[PDB]
């Protein structure tokens, strides 16, 4: 699993199921894995799930 990497949400994201990670613009998401070209997996707000790469920017 990925360690020490984070992304910041650029927009709010409300998922379609509990497999998807909900967040608000500005939230910092702790990255865990990459699902495919368009989706990442991470944790924020106590939950773990998938979300779109296009909704975040990777932090330095």
């Amino acid at each position: 699993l990925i360690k020490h990497m984070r992304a910041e949400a650029l927009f709010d994201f409300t998922g379609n199921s509990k497999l998807e990670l909900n967040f608000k613009a500005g939230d910092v998401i702790f990255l865990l894995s990459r699902i495919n070209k368009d989706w990442l997996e991470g944790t924020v707000r106590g939950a773990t799930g998938i979300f779109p790469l296009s909704f975040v920017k990777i932090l330095k």
Binding site: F11, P52, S54
Partner: peptide, 13 residues
């Protein structure tokens, strides 16, 4: 700013 479109979800159907 408007939210971008959501990419197709992973699937096997």
């Amino acid at each position: 700013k408007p939210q971008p479109a959501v990419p197709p979800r992973p699937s096997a159907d």
